[PDB]
């Protein structure tokens, strides 16, 4: 499966991809899973996590 | 819904969350969508993208 960018995006970190509207992108298989923005109830810290590292309670 | 961390994770960028195995985490609503590792066919560059910025071809 190929995706098309709907908008321009500028990278904020060393790991995200900059792209322009119209680019064709393919999903890369990755053991970490998709990444989600999460809040730790335990510590109060907040940021992105790799989905394959967690499980529902 | 709450998730539990299955492993320790150390942050690599300014935006990911470090956590220890056993922490309780909640998903933050986010306009960007989940993030996926992608390869640009157009440019050859590779990195994470916000899913809500793309659509299937």
Residue numbers in the entry:
A (entry chain A), B (entry chain B): 84 to 140
From the paper:
Cellular Src kinase (c-Src) is one of the most representative members of the Src-family kinases (SFKs), a group of non­receptor tyrosine kinases that mediate responses to extracellular stimuli, phosphorylating a broad range of downstream substrates. Although v-Src shares 95% sequence identity with c-Src, this kinase shows uncontrollable activity that is responsible for the occurrence of sarcoma in chickens. A number of these mutations are located in the SH3 domain, which plays a critical role in enzyme function by facilitating the interaction with partner proteins and providing the formation of the closed inactive conformation of the kinase. Here, the crystal structures of three SH3-domain mutants of v-Src were determined to unveil the effects of these oncogenic mutations in this regulatory domain.
